[PDB]
Amino acid sequence: ADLMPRMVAVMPAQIQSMKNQKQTLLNQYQVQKAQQDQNMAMQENATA
Amino acid sequence: TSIDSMTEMMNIQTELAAVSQSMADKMAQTSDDTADVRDHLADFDDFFR
Secondary structure (H helix, E strand, O other): OOOOHHHHHHHHHHHHHHHHHHHHHHHHHHHHHHHHHHHHHHHOOOOO | OOOOOHHHHHHHHHHHHHHHHHHHHHHHHHHHHHHHHHHHHOOOOOOOO
């Protein structure tokens, strides 16, 4: 009964790491999507 | 940070394993004693059987 609370208190640290990773993934998606779409818009009809 | 948390979790799991082993051994000894008690009680009362 003394060991159990230690395992309980271990958990929250990992969830914060997962949340931060999700935020990083969303920001990365936005940045790379914008870059790719901008490049495709600029390079369109450049073979004229 | 996640690696640190997992390492702590593994240490706690090892401690739980040790606790479980100690509990199993002590319960085995207790069951042996209770079996002795039951054998004594069953062998008794033959005067009253």
